[PDB]
Design a protein around this ligand. Structure first.
Ligand SMILES: COC1=C(OC)C(=O)C(C/C=C(\C)CC/C=C(\C)CC/C=C(\C)CC/C=C(/C)CC/C=C(\C)CC/C=C(\C)CC/C=C(\C)CC/C=C(/C)CCC=C(C)C)=C(C)C1=O
Ligand SMILES: CCCCCCCCCCCCCCCCCC(=O)O[C@@H](COC(=O)CCCCCCCCCCCCCCC)COP(=O)(O)OCC[N+](C)(C)C
Ligand SMILES: CCCCCCCCCCCCCCCCCC(=O)O[C@@H](COC(=O)CCCCCCCCCCCCCCC)COP(=O)(O)OC[C@H](O)CO
Ligand SMILES: CCCCCCCCCCCCCCCCCCCC(=O)O[C@H](COC(=O)CCCCCCCCCCCCCC)COP(=O)(O)OCCN
Lengths: 64, 488, 90, 58, 98, 39, 138, 92, 324, 55
């Protein structure tokens, strides 16, 4: 969220964080920017892609 | 490239003055020409001068300390609240240093490193109040904690000091470990450490739609660490022992300056800890427990410094009442109570160091003090009544407006417990007045007069305490400005 | 799973340090090395979290924690040395 | 001249340090064809992996 | 290094010379600045003298106090002069020369 | 100042040499660098 | 499998630390904890910190403890069926790839430099406190 | 990257085996305080060297600012070391 | 991938033989200084003497006291031998003649050098002898004290190079060797390595029966042999490091004539031989330091001076922008 | 008492180990000289007619 990367290029989840911060800078309520906030948080640790892939694996395995 | 340093400008001076004092006191305390002079009063006076000079440097540049704020943004952000907290912390440190001068001569404790370590702890506290991050806060906490561990066991051949120093060390390291675990486990779940970027991704969403276990648990761990630092029940495992064993000038400084900085840290954390379901109730419960335990534990205490330690714990509970409200008036009551408690603690420890000349240990030693030294007797009685919250004195205004803030949030259970604990504490406060105005024991103990430093500080504090409810407007206005500056 | 095997390991190390510091009033040595174990656990937390989400605010603080831990150990051993010269209690 | 007698063990250790150095070369070139490369950063290892893949597909 | 000097609270007075140089603010020391830079040094020297008579360090303590006071007084004079230059102080003496 | 300096140097040649070397190493980027950067 | 065995060995050593009777064996298992967690850091990607752990914890802190002790006595479920070559490598970041030291010293000494000086002050405080407590010069 | 440590680990294993068999073959046929102070001094200067390593490598990237920020750290710890010097912690 | 142990053995066995022959080399070149000949009856010119010593130590069944601890008293020589041997995995010989091409080679060497202190601490305590324990503790303190000087000199070298890779440092000396500009740093590094390995005027471990008797006073044939092998391997390693940093590792002297097209693997060897000759010369040239003045010397002559050299080199490079 | 010209020479000599390289070079002069030891089994030391040995 700070910008500095491990390999010295750029933060992996820095573009999403900066987009969320910029949009929330000029938004009165915080419930209009929860669309981007969830996106940034998911980009941090993949809270939905992993669920999707795990559900794919489970529904494939349940074919027995 | 040099004008950017006007923001951190006073801290540079205090660091450089500490280095100069260390160099002077190590060069001239070993020379055979001056046959190893004590060199403790000299370093103490020079350190008091340095603290006053950096206080002037900080106060005069009020419109300063804000330029190049973008450059310093990642490191520390000092708004109006930070300025007013630092200008008071420096005053308290200067008062303590001026207090602990006769202790360097009559006790014959000539170790100049004491003042140098006090100065370094003061710089750590200054770095702590403006620490607008999860890293600078921990670094400054450790910086003050190391100096405190070292100076708690400063007297080596004694037995209570070293044991208390070891226990303080263990408790502080354990607290720091918990706090650092909390900081790490909220960094890994949010990706951010700076307070601007931490009060933006969780302020609008705390448990409303869903919750994350990591961030809540880390917030709880941070709160546990902070409560350990301020010695709030039940996180007070060894604090009275630390107050007993530590040298009296140390515990005079150990119960005033650190609490101000830690409470500034808690206030700065509260601007992002917007959960309301993880921070307010824990501090509410801890405040109730601290008041109850302090009131029922200082009743049985027969020593003097143990009673002061438990009274400080009870006052910390009353202080936490005002933070539990979580409103502007709550924070205002918080700051007013902190200021009043700091002044009153300076008063009480000025008394204790005054009576330290003849090694006062128990509450009964100061018996029949109304005849030998009537003026000191009435001063100490006024201090005890100010602790009791007796109306016509300072120390009642703080508890008054604290209770008013508590009723502002509708926490009626807090008010009743506060009343009961106030009555109980008033009883054992006036118990001291009984021991030294009414009861006349067969054996009398005579106390030698004090020095001009303690006497002048005592007179100023005693006139402040009694005559405060006639002109309290400046404190109320400055505390409201400080509380209102916390958020905007 | 790879992040779980790191975080659980660090958390169990932290809990083990808590146990070591909270199972004996005597034996100051292990009660003080439990602090170092706790610092190791939190340092590993910082490093793993920094690598996992590609940010270099955990590595800087991880490196700075080294000095705090070393200074705490040094002061602890100083106090432990001076406590025998008065008491001599293990 | 006789001082070369003491220099004989030094010559032994020098030459056998030399063979210690050259052993990790004459056999690394043996089973990789090309010798070791000083460096091998992320770009280099990616290039080696891609070369392995393209030779495997070729 | 990328530096950006800018105050959140803008200067209330004229804002001439937004980023002055070190020798420039050193050369802008008015009579008041010299006076307040000298009084602090004098107080520090005399405090170092009076404090260091019991241990027996009659002069070196005075020298150390002089160093401390000199640094503090120069710091105060620089702070006042610079703050006057960036604008957020009552100047009435710099706009006259500018 | 020329009488105590030689006494100090005579007693501690190593400390004096280290001080001179460090002084040169700190003097080069404090004086030579600002004037060399302006050509 | 390399991670699990290393973590288990580290856990066993740590458990023996807080249970060993004589302090020397506890200190040696304490050393072993860092010895087997440095490898865990190393296989995670960070090589600088792996060596710093050896140099500091079992190079300076552990030898300090030894000197004192000698006297005074939602995971992704394993799916390799179609998740083994989907790794989209980007060659833009491979050219001029900084090691651990370069990308850390880029910003340790320049941007977050006050925390560096606060650490320096902490070290000075420790150095001062280590001599005002333990000294019997004669 | 980290693939250069596998030869080191295997070398360590082989060295352990050789050392073990070397001593397995023949079977077929009062308190001081200066030490603690010097150990702490070593710990402090070891931390100094640990901090020096990133500075020296990344020294061309940061010029005239990183150098002086490191010299300030060196000055602080040199003041500390000078204090150690006069307090009789270096000579015996 | 099965050929890695082949490389490891090709590193280990010649190095053990090198230690064995270095013992003979010193016992002969020190004897030649004192109007002697050394062992010249066993082999051709004693060339079979190290084999005789090794076989005699293989025989002569160990006494194995193991009074305090069976394990630690037996494990300490193993640990010190492993630490002595393991640092050779990163030393580069000519170009690709290096086992592991680490990017943190200097830090790895520093860690290995500082990690060998335990081998003379647990070994010292394991023997139930006050004269062994106290002497081993003091020797450990000396090595720990000179470790920081070693590290500071390494930082001085690293400033000019710009990378921690060992093979890159030698390639950085194409223009000139580092012994030319910063020669006093080379002298300090050599003296510190003398103190680090307990050799020449700092070797209090072989101070007979004075306050220091040695950590290996009561050891059987093979444990004493392992300690001896390990610390002579350390001697060879430090000579190699000293000639790799401040001298060209494999680069020719001045490559002006035409006969300097010979393989670079022997330039390293002859330079290491030169530094070993200096080691033995200094041993049989000067008397010993007492331990009290050794500590003061190592803390007040080599730490401030190495710090000043670090500061001066860094300032000079930054001032003129002569940075890598 | 010093004159700023002798302290320089003395400090330099104590800093460059001149008195140590003096002995270092001295010890090397016998390295290349002929040796003195005798091969005892073949050539033995000179005795005297008055030597007292086995009766
Ligand atoms: C200081 O006092 C001492 C001495 O006096 C100097 C000794 O000489 C010694 C003698 C020690 C030695 C001769 C060590 C020699 C040991 C050996 C040669 C056996 C181990 C060597 C190997 C296994 C490598 C052999 C394999 C090859 C050469 C492969 C060839 C390709 C000791 C132990 C001592 O303590
Ligand atoms: C410029 C370097 C900046 C960094 C310096 C860091 C230094 C930090 C620690 C400071 C230590 C200062 C030690 C210097 C004092 C050395 C002694 C000395 O110079 O004073 C003399 C003499 O000093 C004096 O007499 C007067 C002192 C000067 C006071 C004038 C005003 C203060 C100076 C202004 C500020 C100083 C600026 C220095 C240059 C920047 C001592 O005389 P006595 O010992 O008292 O006489 C003999 C006593 N007896 C008969 C018993 C044998
Ligand atoms: C704001 C004040 C700043 C100036 C304070 C100067 C520092 C004062 C240090 C005094 C502490 C001390 O050194 O003790 C001596 C006390 O020092 C003094 O007596 C006075 C010191 C100077 C204070 C007066 C200076 C006036 C200047 C103030 C600012 C104008 C010892 O007194 P004694 O042993 O002589 O006691 C016996 C006595 O004579 C019998 O009656
Ligand atoms: C709010 C309403 C009530 C407040 C009323 C305030 C009234 C205005 C203030 C009145 C002040 C009157 C002072 C009269 C002048 C006395 C001057 C004496 C100075 C002096 O003698 O020098 C030294 C005394 O230290 C000293 O005297 C200076 C040190 C004093 C320490 C004071 C520290 C102030 C900073 C912290 C204050 C607390 C702030 C808490 C928020 C040496 O003394 P000596 O010559 O006798 O010889 C040594 C004996 N030991």
């Amino acid at each position: 969220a700070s910008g500095w990367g491990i390999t010295g290029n750029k933060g992996r989840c820095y573009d999403f964080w900066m987009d969320f911060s910029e949009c929330m800078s000029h938004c009165r309520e915080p419930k209009d920017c929860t669309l981007l906030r969830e996106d940034y948080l998911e980009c941090l640790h993949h809270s939905k892609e992993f669920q999707r892939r795990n559900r794919i694996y489970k529904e494939e395995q349940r074919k027995l | 490239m040099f004008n950017l340093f006007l923001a951190v400008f006073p801290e540079i001076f205090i660091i450089n003055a500490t280095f100069i004092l260390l160099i002077h006191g190590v060069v001239f305390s070993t020379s055979k020409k001056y046959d190893y002079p004590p060199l403790a009063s000299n370093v103490g006076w020079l350190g008091l001068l340095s603290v006053l000079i950096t206080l002037l440097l900080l106060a005069a540049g009020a419109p300063l300390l804000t330029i190049a704020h973008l450059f310093w943004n990642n490191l520390f952000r000092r708004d109006n609240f930070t300025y007013f907290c630092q200008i008071f912390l420096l005053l308290s440190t200067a008062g303590t240093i001026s207090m602990c001068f006769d202790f360097f001569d009559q006790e014959r404790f000539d170790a100049f490193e004491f003042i140098v370590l006090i100065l370094l702890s003061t710089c750590g506290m200054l770095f702590m109040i403006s620490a607008y991050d999860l890293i600078a806060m921990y670094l400054a906490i450790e910086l003050q904690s190391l100096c405190f561990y070292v100076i708690a066991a400063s007297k080596r051949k004694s037995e209570f000091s070293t044991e208390a120093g070891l226990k303080y060390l263990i408790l502080g390291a354990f607290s720091s470990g918990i706090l650092l675990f909390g900081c790490s486990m909220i960094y890994g779940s949010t990706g951010a450490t700076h307070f601007d970027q931490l009060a933006k991704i969780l302020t609008g969403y705390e448990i409303t739609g869903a919750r994350s276990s990591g961030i809540f648990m880390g917030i709880l761990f941070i709160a546990v660490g902070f409560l350990f630092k301020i010695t709030a029940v039940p996180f007070h495992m060894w604090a009275p022992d630390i107050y007993e064993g530590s040298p009296t000038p140390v515990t005079a400084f150990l119960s005033i300056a650190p609490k101000i900085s830690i409470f500034a840290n808690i206030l700065r954390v509260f601007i992002y800890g917007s959960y309301g379901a993880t921070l307010q109730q824990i501090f509410f419960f801890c405040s109730i427990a601290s008041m109850i335990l302090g009131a029922l534990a200082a009743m049985a205490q027969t020593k003097v410094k143990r009673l002061l330690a438990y009274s400080s714990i009870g006052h910390v509970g009353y202080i936490c009442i005002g933070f539990s409200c979580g409103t502007i008036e709550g924070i205002q009551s918080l700051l007013i109570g902190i200021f009043i408690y700091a002044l009153m603690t300076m008063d009480a420890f000025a008394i204790v160091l005054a009576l330290r000349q003849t090694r006062v240990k128990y509450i009964a030693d100061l018996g029949a003090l109304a005849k030998t030294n009537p003026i000191l007797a009435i001063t100490f009685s006024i201090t005890m009544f100010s602790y009791a919250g007796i109306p016509p004195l300072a120390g009642f205004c703080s508890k008054f407006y604290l209770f008013f803030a508590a009723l502002g949030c509708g926490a009626y259970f807090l008010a009743l417990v506060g009343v009961v604990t106030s009555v109980i504490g008033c009883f054992y406060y006036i118990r001291l007045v009984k021991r030294m105005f009414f009861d006349t024991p067969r054996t009398w103990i005579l106390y030698e007069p004090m020095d001009r430093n303690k006497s002048l500080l005592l007179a100023m504090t005693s006139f402040f305490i009694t005559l405060f409810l006639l002109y309290p407007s400046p404190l109320f206005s400055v505390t409201h400005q400080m509380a209102l500056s916390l958020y905007l | 799973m790879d992040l779980i095997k790191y975080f659980t390991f660090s958390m169990i190390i932290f809990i083990l340090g808590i146990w070591g510091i909270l199972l004996n009033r005597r034996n100051i040595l292990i009660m003080l090395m439990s602090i170092e174990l706790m610092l190791l656990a939190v340092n590993l937390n910082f490093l793993v979290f920094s690598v996992s989400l590609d940010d270099m605010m955990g590595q800087v603080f991880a490196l700075l924690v080294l000095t705090v831990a070393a200074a705490e150990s040094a002061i602890g051993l100083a106090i432990f040395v001076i406590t025998f010269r008065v008491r001599g209690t293990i | 001249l006789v001082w070369l007698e003491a220099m004989l063990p030094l010559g032994i250790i020098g030459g056998m340090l030399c063979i210690m150095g050259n052993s990790q070369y004459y056999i690394h070139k043996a089973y990789h064809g090309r010798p070791k490369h000083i460096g091998h950063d992320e770009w280099d290892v990616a290039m080696e992996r891609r070369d392995k893949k393209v030779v495997e597909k070729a | 290094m990328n530096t950006d000097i800018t105050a959140l609270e803008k200067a209330q007075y004229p804002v001439v010379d937004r980023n002055p140089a070190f020798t420039k603010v050193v050369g802008n020391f008015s009579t008041l600045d010299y006076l307040r830079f000298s009084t602090i040094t004098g107080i520090s020297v005399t405090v170092g003298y009076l404090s260091g008579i019991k241990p027996g360090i009659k002069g070196p303590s005075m020298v150390t106090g002089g160093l401390i006071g000199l640094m503090g007084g120069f710091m105060y004079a620089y702070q006042n002069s610079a703050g006057r230059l960036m604008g957020f102080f009552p100047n009435d003496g710099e706009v006259a020369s500018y | 100042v020329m009488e105590k300096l030689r006494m100090f140097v005579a007693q501690e040649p190593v400390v004096a040499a280290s001080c001179l070397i460090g002084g040169v190493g700190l003097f080069l980027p404090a004086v030579v660098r600002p004037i060399l950067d302006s050509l | 499998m390399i991670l699990s065995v290393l973590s288990s060995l580290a856990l066993v050593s740590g458990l023996m630390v807080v249970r060993a009777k004589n302090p020397v064996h506890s200190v040696l298992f304490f050393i072993l904890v860092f010895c087997d967690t440095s490898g865990l850091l190393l296989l995670l990607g960070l090589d600088f910190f792996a060596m710093i752990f050896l140099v500091v914890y079992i190079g300076a802190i552990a030898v300090l403890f030894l000197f004192v002790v000698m006297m005074f006595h939602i995971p992704l479920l394993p799916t390799q069926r179609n998740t083994t070559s989907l790794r989209y490598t980007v060659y833009a970041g491979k050219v001029r790839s900084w090691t651990n030291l370069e990308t850390l010293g880029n910003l340790l000494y320049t941007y977050y430099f006050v925390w560096f000086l606060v650490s320096s002050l902490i070290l000075l405080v420790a150095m001062i406190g280590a001599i005002v407590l333990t000294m019997h010069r004669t | 990257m980290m693939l250069e440590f596998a030869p080191i680990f295997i070398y360590l294993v082989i060295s352990l085996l050789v050392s073990l068999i070397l001593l397995g073959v023949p079977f077929l046929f009062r308190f001081d305080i200066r030490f603690y102070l010097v150990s702490i001094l070593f710990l402090i200067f070891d931390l100094e060297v640990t901090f020096f390593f990133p500075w020296a490598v990344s020294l061309n990237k940061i010029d005239l600012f990183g150098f002086w920020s490191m010299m300030a750290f060196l000055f602080i710890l040199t003041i500390g070391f000078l204090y150690e010097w006069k307090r009789g912690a270096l000579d015996w | 991938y099965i050929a890695v142990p082949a490389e490891i053995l090709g590193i280990i066995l010649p190095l053990l033989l090198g230690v064995a022959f270095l013992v003979l080399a010193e016992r002969k070149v020190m004897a030649f200084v004192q109007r002697r000949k050394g062992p010249d009856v066993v082999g051709s010119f004693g060339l079979l003497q190290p084999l005789a010593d090794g076989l005699k130590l293989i025989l002569k069944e160990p006494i194995s006291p193991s009074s305090a601890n069976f394990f630690l008293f037996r494990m300490a020589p193993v640990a010190t031998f492993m630490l002595s041997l393991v640092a050779w995995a990163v030393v580069p010989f000519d170009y690709g003649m290096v086992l592991s091409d680490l990017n943190i080679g200097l830090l790895y060497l520093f860690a290995i050098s500082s990690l060998g202190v335990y081998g003379i601490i647990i070994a010292g305590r394991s023997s139930n002898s006050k004269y062994a324990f106290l002497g081993a503790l003091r020797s450990a303190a000396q090595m720990v004290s000179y470790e920081v000087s070693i590290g500071l000199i390494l930082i001085t070298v690293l400033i000019c190079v710009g990378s921690c890779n060992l093979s890159e440092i030698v390639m950085a000396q194409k223009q000139i060797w580092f012994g030319i500009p910063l020669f006093p740093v080379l002298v300090m590094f050599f003296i510190s390595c003398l103190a680090e390995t307990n050799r020449a005027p700092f070797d209090l471990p072989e101070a007979e029966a004075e306050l220091v008797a040695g950590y290996n006073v009561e050891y059987s044939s093979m444990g004493f042999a392992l300690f001896f092998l390990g610390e002579y391997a350390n001697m060879i390693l430090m000579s190699g490091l000293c000639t790799l940093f401040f001298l060209g590792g494999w680069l020719p002297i001045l490559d002006l004539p035409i006969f300097k097209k010979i393989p670079g693997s022997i330039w390293f060897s002859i330079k290491v031989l030169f530094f070993l000759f200096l080691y033995i010369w200094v041993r049989a040239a000067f008397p010993r330091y007492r331990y009290d003045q050794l500590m003061g010397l190592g803390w007040k002559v080599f730490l401030p001076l190495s710090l000043a050299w670090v500061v001066s080199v860094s300032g000079l490079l930054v001032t003129f922008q002569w940075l890598p | 008492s010093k004159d700023w010209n002798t302290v320089f020479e003395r400090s330099i000599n104590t800093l460059f180990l001149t008195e140590m390289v003096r002995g270092l070079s001295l010890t090397l002069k016998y390295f290349f000289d002929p040796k003195v030891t005798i091969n005892y089994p073949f050539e033995k030391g000179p005795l005297s007619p008055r030597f007292r040995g086995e009766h």
